[PDB]
Symmetry: C2
Subunit: 126 residues, 2 copies
């Protein structure tokens, strides 16, 4: 919980950039060795870098996916933040957009220790 509120905003905005460019390896480097991801929130967690890498490779490696912040990063003083963003993709030739909110907790080294993504079919658009 060492990153400042300002640092958290920057780290979170960076993450979106890496997702937008699709640099799978740079995204995985942002996560702690033992990070846990819940995406979508409510599903069993993804534990560790190896499994976390598989998620991003499978989700971003495929077609063309774009991601943009749709509002400012809300940052707390205990190394946590939440951000609203939109993910654009094509599903079976159908152009789609998914609205998502990610909540992240960072460790003392500025690495993502926990990530939870809030979204469901209700957040899907065309």
């Amino acid at each position: 919980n060492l990153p400042t509120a300002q640092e958290v905003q920057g780290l979170m905005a960076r993450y979106i950039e890496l997702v937008d460019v699709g640099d799978i390896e740079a995204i995985v480097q942002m996560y702690a060795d033992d990070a846990t991801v819940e995406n979508p929130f409510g599903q069993p967690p993804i534990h560790g870098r190896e499994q976390i890498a598989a998620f991003y490779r499978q989700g971003l490696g495929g077609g063309k996916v774009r991601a943009c912040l749709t509002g400012p990063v809300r940052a707390s003083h205990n190394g946590c933040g939440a951000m609203p963003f939109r993910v654009e993709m094509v599903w079976n030739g159908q152009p789609c957009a998914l609205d998502v909110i990610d909540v992240m907790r960072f460790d003392e080294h500025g690495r993502i220790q926990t990530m939870q993504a809030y979204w469901s079919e209700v957040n899907l658009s065309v």
Copy 2:
């Protein structure tokens, strides 16, 4: 964890409407009797309707606080949702805005069991 994702979106949007009008009575009844609120996230939890009512009583006090959703409510399938919104008030003279993200978990009765508000000074503008 029983309201559907569509129900969560409705409940959360209603909450913003009540905050906007300042209906402190209706807000408190949205909460479970032993609910917990962490606002701002990082600060110690306020528990139970009495304490929660005090928060809204003093925060929305006079009636010069406006609140509006600034994007869709993201809802999961386990009774949780997260939403982006802006609060407008006055800092002893000059009008300012605060960008916040609320994450809420609902119970089998459609009542807010837990609420966490993400924000800090980095989200305050004049």
